[PDB]
Design an enzyme around this catalytic site. Structure first.
Site, short mmCIF file in Angstrom:
data_model
loop_
_atom_site.label_atom_id
_atom_site.label_comp_id
_atom_site.label_asym_id
_atom_site.label_seq_id
_atom_site.Cartn_x
_atom_site.Cartn_y
_atom_site.Cartn_z
N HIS A 177 -3.97 -23.02 30.21
CA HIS A 177 -2.17 -23.35 29.77
C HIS A 177 -1.37 -24.29 29.75
CE1 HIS A 177 -4.38 -19.56 27.68
NE2 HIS A 177 -4.70 -18.73 28.52
N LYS A 219 -11.91 -22.34 20.60
CA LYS A 219 -11.08 -21.00 20.53
C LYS A 219 -10.76 -21.15 19.97
CE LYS A 219 -9.26 -19.32 24.86
NZ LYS A 219 -7.61 -19.27 25.38
N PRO A 220 -10.90 -19.61 19.04
CA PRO A 220 -9.87 -19.06 18.17
C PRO A 220 -8.22 -19.63 18.04
CG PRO A 220 -11.32 -17.28 18.19
CD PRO A 220 -11.40 -18.80 19.17
N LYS A 233 -1.80 -6.21 28.20
CA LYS A 233 -2.24 -5.56 26.86
C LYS A 233 -3.41 -4.49 27.08
CE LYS A 233 -2.90 -8.40 24.17
NZ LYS A 233 -3.24 -9.73 24.56
N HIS A 252 -4.44 -15.41 33.64
CA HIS A 252 -4.82 -14.68 32.74
C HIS A 252 -3.31 -14.81 31.83
CE1 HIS A 252 -5.45 -12.25 29.18
NE2 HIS A 252 -6.27 -12.53 28.81
#
Length: 124
Positions: A12, A41-42, A66, A119
């Site tokens: 990221h 990776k989608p 989430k 994450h």
């Protein structure tokens, strides 16, 4: 094995550019960050702010993740980001991505000591 913090950095962080200046940014970045090695990776988002600025988010606004966990934090300020998503013409090993640049608040899960991002939850 890659540490959680190191994996987050590789997947990221892109502080080398202020923003995605080309439609081919994602094709390039997804490949170079090794996110298309054995499969495409989608979805993946890159943040265009210093590592320090992103790490600082872990001491900013605490919000629910989430998944229901409570170790997520939302950036007080918007940040330059680029979302990379597979297009219909994508098919490994010839991965293809749409590049979408935007300025939004980032939401990341943090953990450990030092307490850092591990994450990517979402952007708003």
């Amino acid at each position: 094995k890659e540490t959680a913090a190191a994996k987050f950095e590789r997947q990221h962080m892109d502080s080398s550019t202020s923003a995605a200046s080309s439609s081919n940014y994602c094709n390039q970045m997804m490949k170079s960050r090794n996110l298309t090695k054995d499969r495409c990776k989608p979805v993946n988002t890159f943040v265009h702010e210093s590592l320090a600025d992103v790490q600082a988010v872990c001491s900013q606004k605490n919000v629910a993740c989430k998944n229901g966990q409570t170790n997520c934090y939302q950036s007080y300020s918007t940040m330059s980001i680029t979302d990379c998503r597979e297009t219909g013409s994508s098919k490994y090993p010839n991965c293809a991505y749409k590049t979408t640049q935007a300025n939004k608040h980032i939401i990341v899960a943090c953990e450990g000591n030092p307490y850092v991002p591990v994450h990517w939850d979402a952007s708003v």
